[PDB]
């Protein structure tokens, strides 16, 4: 018995981020989907690119460590640096937390796009089982499963067989 993303993920799947898993009369198989995978990956790189850009370069600055107490001017210099450190520490905490919420949103979206893409291909020939899987109401051999996966599945071919299996 097979399930999809609604239930849980797939440790089995190692050559892709998303993929198809099918059952027919010829057996059962798992293939990865390249488009959906590269989609997600490409937004993880682009934000990994946005982060290794070093616009921070600083030669002569101010003293940050002291040997004797001085009062007013030392107190200010210590304050300026401690203020700078607090503000950058905040920017980092927020940036990472905010990137990460985006990374999760993007990957959750790409999964759903993949599901909906298949939904559309299948028209009135399949019903959504509720577990991230489609019950296909016609015989679908290995060539037919591959057509779904490579985007050439012509629903008109099987419409009569499938509708007659759904309505009676």
């Amino acid at each position: 018995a097979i399930a999809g993303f609604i239930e849980n993920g797939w440790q089995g799947l190692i050559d892709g981020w998303y993929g198809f898993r099918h059952q027919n009369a010829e057996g059962t198989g798992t293939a990865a989907d390249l488009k959906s995978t590269q989609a997600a990956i490409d937004q993880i790189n682009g934000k990994l690119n946005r982060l290794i850009e070093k616009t921070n370069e600083k030669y002569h600055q101010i003293e940050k460590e002291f040997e004797q107490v001085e009062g007013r001017i030392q107190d200010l210099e210590k304050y300026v640096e401690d203020t700078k450190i607090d503000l950058w520490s905040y920017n980092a905490e927020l940036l990472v937390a905010l990137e990460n919420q985006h990374t999760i949103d993007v990957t959750d979206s790409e999964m759903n796009k993949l599901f909906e893409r298949v939904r559309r291909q299948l028209r009135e020939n399949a019903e959504d089982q509720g577990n991230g899987c489609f019950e296909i109401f016609h015989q679908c051999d290995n060539n037919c499963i591959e057509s779904i996966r490579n985007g050439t599945y012509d629903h008109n071919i099987y419409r009569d067989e499938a509708i007659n299996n759904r309505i009676k």
Partner: peptide, 22 residues
Amino acid sequence: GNPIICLGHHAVENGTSVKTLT
């Protein structure tokens, strides 16, 4: 009789913890 086709995503046995806003 009816074939099934399922759509899924990859997973690992041991993840890594990260922070969002919530």
